[PDB]
Symmetry: D2
Subunit: 321 residues, 4 copies
Amino acid sequence: HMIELTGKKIFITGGAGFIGSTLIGRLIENNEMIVYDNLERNTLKSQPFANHKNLTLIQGNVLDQEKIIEAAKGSEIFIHAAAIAGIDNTVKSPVRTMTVNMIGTANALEAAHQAGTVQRFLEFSTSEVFGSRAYRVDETGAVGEARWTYAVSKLAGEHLTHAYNREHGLPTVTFRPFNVYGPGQIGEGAISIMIRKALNNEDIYIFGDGSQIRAWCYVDDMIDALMKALSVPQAIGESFNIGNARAITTIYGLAQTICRVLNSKSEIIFREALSADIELRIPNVDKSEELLGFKAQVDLEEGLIRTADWLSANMNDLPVM
Amino acid sequence: HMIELTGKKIFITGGAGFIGSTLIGRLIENNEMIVYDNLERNTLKSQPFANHKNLTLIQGNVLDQEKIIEAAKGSEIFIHAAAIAGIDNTVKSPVRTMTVNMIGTANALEAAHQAGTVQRFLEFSTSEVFGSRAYRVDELNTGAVGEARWTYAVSKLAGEHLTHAYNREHGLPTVTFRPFNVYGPGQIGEGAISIMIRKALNNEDIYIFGDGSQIRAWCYVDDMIDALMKALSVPQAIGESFNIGNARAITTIYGLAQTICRVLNSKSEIIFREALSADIELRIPNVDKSEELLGFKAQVDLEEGLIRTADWLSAN
Amino acid sequence: MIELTGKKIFITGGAGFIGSTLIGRLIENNEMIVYDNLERNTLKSQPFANHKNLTLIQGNVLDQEKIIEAAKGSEIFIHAAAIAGIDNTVKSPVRTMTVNMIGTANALEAAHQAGTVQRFLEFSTSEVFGSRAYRVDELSTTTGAVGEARWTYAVSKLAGEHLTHAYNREHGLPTVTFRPFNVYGPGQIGEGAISIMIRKALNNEDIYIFGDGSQIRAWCYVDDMIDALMKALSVPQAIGESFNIGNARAITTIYGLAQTICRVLNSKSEIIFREALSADIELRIPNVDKSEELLGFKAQVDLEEGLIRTADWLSANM
Amino acid sequence: HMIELTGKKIFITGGAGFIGSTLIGRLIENNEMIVYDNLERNTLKSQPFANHKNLTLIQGNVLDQEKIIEAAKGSEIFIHAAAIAGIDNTVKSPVRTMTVNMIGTANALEAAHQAGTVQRFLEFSTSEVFGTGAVGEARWTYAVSKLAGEHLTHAYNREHGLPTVTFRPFNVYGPGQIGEGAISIMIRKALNNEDIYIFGDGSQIRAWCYVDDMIDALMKALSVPQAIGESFNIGNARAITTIYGLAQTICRVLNSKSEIIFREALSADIELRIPNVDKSEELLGFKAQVDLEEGLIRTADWLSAN
Ligand SMILES: NC(=O)c1ccc[n+]([C@@H]2O[C@H](COP(=O)([O-])OP(=O)(O)OC[C@H]3O[C@@H](n4cnc5c(N)ncnc54)[C@H](O)[C@@H]3O)[C@@H](O)[C@H]2O)c1
Ligand SMILES: NC(=O)c1ccc[n+]([C@@H]2O[C@H](COP(=O)([O-])OP(=O)(O)OC[C@H]3O[C@@H](n4cnc5c(N)ncnc54)[C@H](O)[C@@H]3O)[C@@H](O)[C@H]2O)c1
Ligand SMILES: NC(=O)c1ccc[n+]([C@@H]2O[C@H](COP(=O)([O-])OP(=O)(O)OC[C@H]3O[C@@H](n4cnc5c(N)ncnc54)[C@H](O)[C@@H]3O)[C@@H](O)[C@H]2O)c1
Ligand SMILES: NC(=O)c1ccc[n+]([C@@H]2O[C@H](COP(=O)([O-])OP(=O)(O)OC[C@H]3O[C@@H](n4cnc5c(N)ncnc54)[C@H](O)[C@@H]3O)[C@@H](O)[C@H]2O)c1
Ligand SMILES: O=c1ccn([C@@H]2O[C@H](COP(=O)(O)OP(=O)(O)O)[C@@H](O)[C@H]2O)c(=O)[nH]1
Ligand SMILES: O=c1ccn([C@@H]2O[C@H](COP(=O)(O)OP(=O)(O)O)[C@@H](O)[C@H]2O)c(=O)[nH]1
Ligand SMILES: O=c1ccn([C@@H]2O[C@H](COP(=O)(O)OP(=O)(O)O)[C@@H](O)[C@H]2O)c(=O)[nH]1
Ligand SMILES: O=c1ccn([C@@H]2O[C@H](COP(=O)(O)OP(=O)(O)O)[C@@H](O)[C@H]2O)c(=O)[nH]1
Ligand code: NA
């Protein structure tokens, strides 16, 4: 049945983070929202709505199976967003990435299952699941091994999610965002770095031959998809790739786009890459269109400008090298 | 890092089962051995060394992280054999298969890591990991049996992934060991070879379910044990994954039935019947690395191994 | 749609094994022209070799002018001329590629210019699908002589399929692509594994298994293949389609095949492993469900029965 | 075994088109050159060396087996460039595409073989080889017709010892041709601040090779003995980009005010993987020197002047 996103108890693991903070902003006026988060990151505390009457912060680890079961009782929409995704974090501690992502998802599924009240379980996976298949434990550089580690940790969570769907009829939705950019993101990914350089006409360096592919999704597009995924009955039992087919580019092509759209004079320079990466193919987004009725509306030019606007407005809150 | 397999403290999760019991038989005279098993199966009890002074049985679940950490203290060789591999059980409860295999393996690795004394950690995976890449979680529609086999395969592959992480991050001296299906004396068994030998010996009909073209790879018990001894000892095993079996003992089900009936001089008829459930197609992996690095090459082919198995089955 | 009586039939490679066999079934009711260079000649040994309805033209499919001329007025055009040479002592990839690729082009063009063709049936091979997993620039002692010759054969047939498709799409030539699994049965001695192992088994001679014996081969009994052929040549929904023609129950390993042969024929032959003479490649066996659904074909002769029929023919003919 | 590209008898099928004209321009001063072309295209007749004393034009079809065999007699370098290529030509007929490319290569190979004198046979293939309207049909047809030519080339090398090189250029661009490709149209539009249309989601990859790099690669392949029996991907690893990315690059590099606008494609995307170019560096000592920025500017300069 269609779910109306008002008057619901919404439980969000990882809810202190970027995506979770964003979704809270959008739903908190009309719903009780409980964040379950170990505050490894805390985007949420810096929002207007951090102290809303409808908002609860439970500090907890998804690896604590007992605590997540209790905290999730009565919840009607369960959103599982807690994870470790950082490449450098994964180089250093692959065990923590694997464990948090695989066992955390098991634990979240079990909590949702035991609650008995969950009308939608939404599991955040990742697009790199697709590319990951053409590599092997048996068989790249530190970056590549860490990206593989991340991807397979998320794939294992999808497998668990499927088993709960099949065995228990848990109403699951697997949600795989392309890399999200936009206002709100502080971060040190290519878009935020390159916009910041371009705005000041600083040199932009391309590590490698610049032909590596990255797909993006603008923040507001990802959120619109998420509301559909959380609501429409056709999402249940289904997996979705969430992004913009028009926002798939090479890193060199991204640098040219950003400099062009911002009227930047930045010079773009080729450097040697610091580590070999693995090449992953970008998945198709048609099923999101077909079943969620979702088609991304914010193309790169618009998205990059809106992002550059927010970065300039908020230029006192980061620094990098 | 050549390990001599005497005078060691050996800890074996799932040690009450078929492979654990069999390996204990070979090591118990010269080693302190600890079994950690919840006794879903218990082959060990039927053995004559069940009550050896060198043997301790700890009844516990690999999901009980505290208990397994404690039980594994001081262990010098850690063998993780506990798992759920049953197709019918995995049909009924895929969550239990995934949980026991993935989380049980996580807990086993953590217990080995925490012990600090482990010289070799050997994790039992499964050959179907290789086939499983052909399929997609969001594509499954496979039949019940095929979805169950896939579920089992991916649960094992997650285990391998965890194992890799511990090796890379903490230097845990790991070996991933993927046995082809094991047959021979000591498995009374329930899979095709055991069933088909028993039928053939009494000239009963052997029914082939579906088109008979499904591939199964096999390994004779003594070959698998030999490989395991190499994997537990030899320094080249550390950080590697091995497919353990016999490249001459890969056959179709129809082919297997023909082979069993010829070799045993059976008068059984072999008769086609409808399949009960669709299954997944799995490619069999290469066993070459096992020769190169462990010095292991299986010596018992099907003709010899089927006869040895039938002799045992008749005598019992 | 097409009733296989009163038709003008033109068959390249008609002197060969499958061509000969098909001629037995149609020659009573159809005018048939065989276009063949007689590199092989099964036809000359058959009772109908000199039938009033049969005309032989000794010609090469690489002689573009002759085949166009010879094919004039044909209503059913069957392109069966091909070579393989996978296991041959003297490897000739050029011969295989030119005969199969260009021979197919010249046949298609002969069919197209006659204007009269209602059905064009091209023989391909099941190996075309697996072939895509290998790359021409990455062929090694990985591949071996037999591997490379099997790849040569497969890609020469795949090119023929592409040609056939182009003629279908551009010119509306009514084409059918027919991919027989390896055919065995009465009518020829043969040099394949079934023939060789049956002859050994009948004399209790040792059977040797090259490599590890786990190589898979799929087999189709001759009568089943001819039944599929008759349906492909007639039924309307065959046009513009490709078919994998086999028996799902006769897909086995070479060792399992040996064991089956010895058991079925009550032989005392030993079966012994030996190192392979040459490295081979691995090619997937495609699914046959569409053939059943669209042609209404399902193979009815399983290996036990087929091996007995074959062995009886071999014993009576030697 | 290193071949010196002077004083040779060079036979080029398809020598009247773009790449053939270009190569003739570099070699005609110092070699006897025979062009074997049916003149479906004829860039050559526009060139100052069209009537050079060292150039003989034979107007012929690579489908005429006996003629090409005769014409190629005594040839020391055999360059097989004859093909139905460019969507303008290939869209016309899948049959003609498949036939000229596959059979034409077979015939070229047989001509080189029968000559007995060929020290290098260079076969042009296409980078699409290892990737449903008339247009998608003609591209697929082109790709497999070229892959079939690679197969025949292999067979000849293996069986007869023919000293073959399979040469697979990325899409060639640069001065000396208005052109028909994306770079051509997009630069023209950009130079006029004319809006550029992107059909589909614009994610389609295209890799490029600057004409002068392609020619430098071709010279190495024709001479260096390590080229024999090999297949090469010839292009610039830094000049792989999406169609949308290319449009952004052209507009920025040329300071254009063109808008880049998405439009509908009823066609389905072809996700071609782009091959690796390392072997060319290792074996030919070839690495592309003209990157996109520089190439686009030289292209724009030529287009402007003309
Ligand atoms: N943002 C993207 O571009 C993107 C792309 C692909 C996938 N995703 C996935 O979407 C989800 C949300 O992403 P995000 O960008 O908001 O990331 P984020 O890091 O901002 O949010 C994740 C949150 O999880 C919390 N957390 C980490 N470990 C935890 C643990 N053990 N127990 C409890 N909480 C824990 C962190 O404190 C953080 O607030 C994640 O699963 C991520 O992998 C995001
Ligand atoms: N026998 C084979 O042919 C084969 C093939 C492939 C893989 N393997 C793997 O090798 C290992 C050993 O195989 P086996 O044939 O001896 O299996 P088995 O079933 O005989 O032994 C496994 C043992 O694990 C125990 N166990 C199950 N769940 C447990 C849990 N939660 N906690 C503790 N103990 C638990 C069972 O009681 C049983 O004794 C397993 O990992 C299996 O998947 C075996
Ligand atoms: N028999 C099989 O198991 C099998 C399997 C797969 C595909 N096929 C294909 O089916 C078709 C027929 O097979 P078959 O078993 O009858 O083979 P076959 O060799 O018995 O018959 C082919 C005929 O083509 C003739 N021929 C060869 N080259 C010629 C040329 N250049 N010009 C004219 N005639 C020429 C031969 O003389 C022969 O009579 C062939 O295309 C073959 O590739 C057969
Ligand atoms: N230009 C590129 O970017 C590019 C890219 C990949 C591959 N290639 C290949 O490189 C080679 C040259 O490319 P190009 O751009 O110079 O092409 P082109 O079309 O300019 O040249 C092909 C030439 O072959 C001739 N020709 C066509 N059909 C013929 C026939 N039947 N007999 C004889 N001659 C015939 C044409 O008249 C023309 O001069 C071709 O083989 C082409 O497939 C080119
Ligand atoms: O200024 C920059 C930032 C990033 N990159 C490259 O662009 C890709 C995307 O980097 P990002 O930081 O977005 O993270 P990733 O997607 O690799 O995790 C990687 O190959 C980076 O090396 C680059 O060349 N220049
Ligand atoms: O008498 C028998 C026993 C098994 N099988 C088939 O042989 C395969 C192997 O079955 P087994 O019991 O060994 O277990 P599985 O490997 O399928 O888990 C399956 O397709 C069974 O259906 C069969 O056709 N006849
Ligand atoms: O006595 C024999 C005959 C054949 N083969 C193997 O069986 C397979 C099929 O052989 P066949 O002669 O039918 O030809 P192919 O299909 O290899 O072209 C090949 O791997 C052969 O090496 C074998 O092991 N023993
Ligand atoms: O300004 C342009 C030029 C090309 N294309 C796309 O790229 C395809 C091929 O363009 P190109 O001119 O490179 O064609 P080719 O050289 O392959 O014949 C077209 O069908 C369009 O989908 C486009 O969208 N905009
Ligand atoms: Na001949």
